[PDB]
Design a protein around this ligand. Structure first.
Ligand SMILES: NC(=O)c1ccc[n+]([C@@H]2O[C@H](COP(=O)([O-])OP(=O)(O)OC[C@H]3O[C@@H](n4cnc5c(N)ncnc54)[C@H](O)[C@@H]3O)[C@@H](O)[C@H]2O)c1
Ligand SMILES: [Zn+2]
Length: 325
């Protein structure tokens, strides 16, 4: 009994996690509807094509595989889209998660690792952001992630569900061995966009603000290597497996990275410059956002190992038509 159900396991972070699980002796079973993920990324165990809203098929799957844990990545998201199409996010992130959690309790499938987001915090009072920070999200994406977190808490109370919610800002980089990458269309994440622009796959990288109250002048955000993310989700499995209590922790390096730093590194490491177009800063935009990683260190024994900028850039670059030298 070493099956682990990786819901959303055909996508960016899910496929890396499936690879890691297999490396640690688990048998990842991917359940994915391929809406944004890729069947070719399911290389480390069985594949079940299915939607998490297809509750009968999800229950059927849990009964067949009797997974010792469920890792939930199955929520697609484009940067900025939730404000214009909140219906999609309430349906998938709230409706879909409820269907998953119902499938779990109805099959006595017990351990749920939920991939959440630091977007749940919204604009913070203190940097870095600690788990105690109020969660006042500013868009439906953040809102629906927060709803899922609370749903987990209510299902724990009612049904004895055990869980770990993992919060982080920006998944980045790719597997060190170069055969598994981030394949999104449209690609809305910053480092892929910057690399695509340097590679000539995009014409321009529009950067909104050289004006921020930071060094650089450009905004600071929080980037974690996807392999580090995989590591944490598996540690979370081990935590619940060794009878750990329910957790909600931040994942990251504890240090932010500016846009200038990223563009600089890409140019330096690849020899291709990023064609930046500086546009006016947005009025209510935060200058710096990054999470405090200490609770995850204490509770999970987790530290990032691959989330230096150099490793993030180096591993991602080949997947976007760039060459590292
Ligand atoms: N990429 C990031 O920067 C980032 C940041 C914060 C949180 N996350 C979390 O990571 C997960 C997204 O992973 P990604 O970043 O790899 O996106 P991704 O789109 O590559 O992977 C998402 C996977 O979920 C599958 N999926 C979507 N809706 C589904 C449904 N209803 N039923 C079944 N399968 C479904 C998609 O086909 C895809 O394979 C989400 O849970 C999100 O909260 C990602
Ligand atoms: Zn992306």
């Amino acid at each position: 009994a070493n099956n682990v159900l990786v819901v959303g396991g055909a996508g960016f972070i899910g496929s890396h996690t499936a690879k890691l699980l297999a490396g640690q002796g688990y048998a990842p079973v991917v359940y994915d509807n391929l809406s944004t993920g890729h069947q070719s990324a399911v290389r480390w165990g069985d594949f079940v094509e299915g939607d998490i809203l297809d509750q009968a098929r999800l229950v059927e799957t849990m009964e067949k595989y009797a997974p010792v844990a469920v890792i939930h990545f199955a929520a697609s998201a484009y940067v900025g889209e939730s404000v214009e199409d909140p219906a999609k996010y309430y349906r998938n992130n709230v409706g879909g998660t409820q269907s998953l959690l119902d499938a779990c309790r109805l099959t006595r499938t017990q351990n749920v690792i939920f991939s959440s987001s630091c977007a749940t915090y919204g604009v913070p009072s203190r940097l870095p952001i600690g788990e105690g920070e109020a969660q006042n999200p500013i868009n439906p994406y953040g809102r629906t992630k927060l709803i899922a977190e609370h749903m987990l808490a209510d299902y724990a109370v009612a049904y004895g569900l055990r869980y770990v919610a993992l919060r982080y800002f920006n998944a980045s980089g790719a597997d060190i061995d170069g055969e598994l990458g981030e394949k999104h269309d449209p690609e809305t994440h910053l480092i892929p966009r910057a690399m695509m622009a340097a590679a000539g796959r995009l014409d321009v990288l529009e950067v909104y603000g050289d004006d921020y109250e930071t060094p650089d002048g450009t905004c600071i955000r929080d980037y974690i290597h996807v392999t580090d993310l995989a590591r944490a989700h598996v540690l979370a499995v081990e935590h619940l497996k060794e009878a750990g209590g329910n957790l909600a922790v931040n994942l990251g390096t504890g240090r932010g990275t500016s846009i200038r730093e990223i563009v600089q590194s890409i140019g330096r490491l690849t020899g291709r410059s990023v064609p930046v177009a500086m546009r006016a800063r947005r009025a209510g935009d935060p200058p710096a956002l990054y999470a405090d990683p200490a609770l995850a260190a204490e509770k999970l024994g987790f530290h990032t190992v691959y989330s230096d900028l150099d490793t993030i850039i180096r591993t991602a670059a080949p997947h976007f038509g760039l060459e590292v030298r």
